[PDB]
Amino acid sequence: TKLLVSLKVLVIQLNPQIGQVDQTIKRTWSILDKVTKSATYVKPDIILFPEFALTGYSFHARKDILPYVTKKDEGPSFELAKSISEKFQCYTIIGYPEEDDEQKLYNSALVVNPQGGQIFNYRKTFLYDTEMNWDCEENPEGFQTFPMDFSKCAKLSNEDSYNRDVTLKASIGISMDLSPYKFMAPFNHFEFSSFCVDNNVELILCPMAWLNSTSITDKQTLHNNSLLEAAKNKIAFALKEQGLPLAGSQGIYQLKIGDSQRTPRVPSDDSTSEYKDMDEPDMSNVNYWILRFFPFLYFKLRINWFKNSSLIESILGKTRMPLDHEYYKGKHDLLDSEEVIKDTVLEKTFLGTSLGQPWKFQGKNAILVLANRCGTEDGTTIFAGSSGIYKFNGKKSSLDSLNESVELLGNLGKGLEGAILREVQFEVFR
Incomplete structure (x- = not known):
């Protein structure tokens, strides 16, 4: 039985800096205020924040992150998500540094329902170099799915309004979850997106703190003070030339609320990676993210x-x-x-193929929501921003945004704080 769904999805893009939790919270309420005052504002069903949305990302020691860690149901990130969910009667998902009762630390995303109750807590499964700095653990459950009960979001094809309820199968993947394991596993394993296809996930949610390739990641450079000083000067100049403070832009909000402007399909070139034009997405990363969802592509x-x-x-x-x-x-x-x-x-699938079908996802729909932070840290690390919403439409071989089996419903820019709201329509089978 085909069931039509319409979800109002709001993504918030922030530039949190370490030690500014209260200021980031204030900017968040400011953004949400401006959103509600939009000409085409509609109430969101779900609101998604980035990885470590209020705390900043580049912690270099366990001691440095300890003042910001929280239990999954206490503290600033949780209280913010509960307040948002209660005020907007929506699901709210936010990334935050977590401590458990046994003093173990995780990089997590908590989910709060429209009643302000915490319904899920997902921990990052594939860790990045930074997490290893502060004793972060891998999710012992591995990748996970969970149900999200949506009210008044669905209809039969014959019906004229979305007056039915629907429980969607959702999965959260935090940034590195999308990468080959440790950057060492074969590229074509596509672990996370294969898992989502294997488990018939319909709503994929990705809080991220994903880098623009202008960032300094070369290990020999990072550990040679002369090479590092020179590299840092290059990034310094690159931001100055843009009229940006070294930490990047804060408090100047790009709002794309309820419009239907789609992101233009574009191939990756030597220029698409440049940290320039802050209100445009980083298409090098947009294309790469799409590629890591290969099993969903025709x-x-x-x-x-x-x-x-x-x-x-x-x-x-x-x-x-x-x-x-x-x-x-x-x-x-x-x-x-x-x-x-x-x-x-x-x-089970490999490269999107199953034992019974050439392409398991064929004829299906799935929604991908990517909330990536913007800004810079340490003078070395430039986040890509470019938060966006995507629909995989399952319809019948470019491995990038040119592939018409993915729909680019809208993106924010690479460099500005802001918010994007899109009505997304798709179908599920029940």
Whole structure:
């Protein structure tokens, strides 16, 4: 049974700096105020913030982050999300540094329902270099899905208003979750997006603190004070030339509220990575993010992969998580056994292909919401901003924004704080 859905999605893009939690909270309320005063404002069903949205990101020691960590149901990030959810009767998802009762630290995203109750807490599964600075843990559950009960958001195709309720299968992936594991696993594993396709996820939510490639990441440079000083000077000049303070822009808000301006499809070039034109998205990263969702994209070659059974061994042989992941540290050959083939094995995919279909996602819909922070930290790290909303439409082989099986519903710029609201329409089957 086809069920039509209409979701009002609001994404907030912030430039939080370490030690400015109260100021960031104030700017957040300012943004939300300006949003409600928009000419085309409509009430959001869901509001998404970036990774470590109120705290800043680049913590260099456990001691430095400890004054900002909180239990999943206490503290500034949680109280903000509860207040927002209660005032807007929506789901609110925010990234925050978490401590648990056993003094373990995580990079997390909490989810609050329209009643102001916390319904979920997701912990980052693939960690980035920065997390290793302060003793962050991997999510022992690995990637996860959860239900989100939406009220008055759905209809049958014959009906004339969205007056039905719907429970969508959602998944949160925090930044590095989208990357090959440790940057060492094969690129074409597409772990997170394969997991979402495998589990028939309909709503994908990604709080991120994702870098623009102008950032200094070369390890030899970071650990040679002469090379580092020279590299920092280059970024300094790059911001000065833009009329920006070294930390990037704060408090000047780009609002795209309820409009229908789509983001132009563009190939990555030597120029699309430049940290220039702050109100335009970083299309190098937009294209890269789209590529990491390859299993959701139409690709002609899958028909040959399926016909030749080229991926059967890959599909059968893949594990739920990487073998050395926290996941197995305590969870735990069908072609050579007498055990039967379970439904779950027939849902598994590799490169978007399953044992039963060339392209498992074909004919389906999924929504991707990416909330990425903007600004700069340490004089070395420039975040890409470019928060956006995407629809994978499942319709029938560029590996970027030119692929028409993804719809770019709208993006913010790479460099300004702000908010984007889009009505997203799609279908699910029930």
